[PDB]
Enzyme design. Sequence first.
Site, PDB file in Angstrom:
ATOM      1  CG  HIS A   1      -0.335   0.026   2.406  1.00 17.86           C
ATOM      2  ND1 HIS A   1      -1.094  -0.457   3.609  1.00 17.86           N
ATOM      3  CD2 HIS A   1       0.857   0.367   3.009  1.00 17.86           C
ATOM      4  CE1 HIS A   1      -0.212  -0.445   4.645  1.00 17.86           C
ATOM      5  NE2 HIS A   1       1.073  -0.051   4.085  1.00 17.86           N
TER       6      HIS A   1
ATOM      7  CG  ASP B   1       0.907  -4.206   2.682  1.00 18.42           C
ATOM      8  OD1 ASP B   1       1.732  -3.341   2.172  1.00 18.42           O
ATOM      9  OD2 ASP B   1      -0.057  -3.818   3.320  1.00 18.42           O
TER      10      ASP B   1
ATOM     11  CB  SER C   1       3.497   1.853   7.223  1.00 19.25           C
ATOM     12  OG  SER C   1       3.024   1.500   6.269  1.00 19.25           O
TER      13      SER C   1
END
Lengths: 242, 23, 11
Positions: free
Chosen positions: A43, A99, A197
Amino acid sequence: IVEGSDAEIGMSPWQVMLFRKSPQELLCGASLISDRWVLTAAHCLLYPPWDKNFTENDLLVRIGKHSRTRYERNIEKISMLEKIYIHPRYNWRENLDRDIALMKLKKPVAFSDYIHPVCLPDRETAASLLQAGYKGRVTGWGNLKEGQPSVLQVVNLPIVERPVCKDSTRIRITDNMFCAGYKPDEGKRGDACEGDSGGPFVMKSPFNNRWYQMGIVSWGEGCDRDGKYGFYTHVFRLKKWI
Amino acid sequence: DCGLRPLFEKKSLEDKTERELLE
Amino acid sequence: XPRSXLKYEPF
């Protein structure tokens, strides 16, 4: 990172920053799985629903990274991608599955005390460890609470019984996603938050006392709630694709 | 050489928290 | 998914 402590000089020569040029800023984090390669969250690079998509062009990458603000002068490294590689069965639509993504640095980064690679599992290594209760350190300069460190942030988390990890959420999880973090009852907190992240989930092997990247910061709906754990990416199942 | 922290492992240091990792 | 929840952007 939620409930964490400040990192040390050399303690993760594998961390790189995902810093776009303008709004000249920091978007995520990554790892040096090469002398010239970098991988990270998916993402973190292609999210339609919140219109995003980049290109080598867009962003530039950074290494040697102790201070989150400063200009790590003669200890900090940096280059811009030469091409990004997303992974073809990605589910930004569904749950942020597989991901993952990698970025072939347009140019090669020579190592030192601050920039030094990480290795990836083998069903073996990926077997000793990837086990309930056995912890892992996750770093980054993300969101101190649910404002941003001045320096790097390190937490440690135990794996979680695959079931319990299921009824933490309500999103449908795949044998490809793995969930960390302490419990409600446990009496102790931690969690990697906003900007944590694309960060590594390096675990230490007692066998060859090597540092093994077990995961990637994918998700979680929150930041240290008495009832849920974060979810990361199987650096492994996907060990094929990598 | 990978996984080999040049400021710890690479020459016997053990970071403040590694050992918490160990148990 | 990422940020976030408990499908709205940052903040």
